[PDB]
Write a protein that binds this ligand. Structure first.
Ligand SMILES: C/C=C/C(=O)c1ccc2cc(OC)ccc2c1
Length: 243
């Protein structure tokens, strides 16, 4: 990884030394990017329900996963420990108790964390341009693919987009986030969406969504929407979205 500052470097250092787990998965991968493409063809609104317990309305992660299973295209499960109160064991039990795709959402800096995700039952992993060099991102990209997991590449700005496309990313999440504040820059997010090629599956992160926003973003080529705060506070809004 890079050498950063602040809590993000603390997290990078935690990831560097995180021990690899002793586990094996219980079902095949269920491809998240492919399921999004299927939902698009079938005209089903594709929502990734984003779960965290803490960050820099706390919910039971199992119960949340089961609640979202009938409606969501996938689940994002935060497995970073110190700042997000994530666990590998919670990932494992979520992945063995729902049959929709699971994104392991963490700060991946080494291959053994990808091994961990596969062995715990995740269907894909997040990779973050900001914390990696291009060479590192390319090597982790190809590592994840090898398992059958098209990773979701996180971009926060145009430089990040350009690195992602330079290494052949096929699945991108547009956070447009300042990790120091947890801000999503909605203006920059729209700009970045408009720069992504049509054959890359593209997923903005939204805390809250406006009436018309989902429709407007779909008109910009968005394939799925990863929604955090609104669904944690009001999980029932996923019904409205799909129905
Ligand atoms: C890649 C996983 C990231 C997040 O879900 C996430 C959530 C809340 C955050 C709040 C912050 O405020 C200081 C900073 C980063 C944050 C990152």
């Amino acid at each position: 990884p890079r050498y950063l500052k602040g809590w993000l470097e603390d997290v990078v250092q935690l990831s560097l030394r995180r021990p690899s787990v002793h586990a094996s998965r219980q079902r095949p991968i269920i491809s998240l990017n492919e399921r999004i493409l299927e939902f698009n063809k079938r005209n089903i609104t594709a929502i990734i329900a984003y779960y965290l317990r803490k960050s820099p309305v706390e919910r039971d992660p199992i119960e949340y996963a089961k609640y979202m299973e009938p409606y969501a295209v996938g689940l994002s499960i935060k497995t970073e420990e110190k700042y997000f109160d994530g666990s590998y064991e919670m990932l494992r039990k979520i992945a063995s108790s729902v049959s929709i795709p699971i994104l392991m959402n963490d700060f991946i800096v080494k291959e053994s964390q990808i091994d961990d995700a596969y062995n715990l039952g995740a269907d894909t992993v997040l990779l973050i341009v900001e914390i990696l060099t291009e060479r590192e991102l390319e090597s982790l990209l190809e590592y994840a693919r090898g398992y059958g997991m098209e990773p979701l590449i996180l971009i926060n700005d145009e430089n990040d987009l350009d690195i992602a496309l330079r290494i052949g990313a096929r699945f991108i999440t547009i956070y447009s986030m300042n990790f120091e504040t947890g801000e999503i820059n909605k203006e920059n997010q729209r700009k970045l969406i408009s720069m992504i090629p049509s054959n890359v599956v593209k997923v903005p992160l939204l805390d809250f969504f406006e009436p018309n926003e989902i429709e407007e973003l779909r008109k910009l080529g968005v394939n799925a929407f990863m929604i955090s705060s609104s669904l944690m506070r009001n999980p029932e809004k996923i019904k409205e979205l799909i129905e």
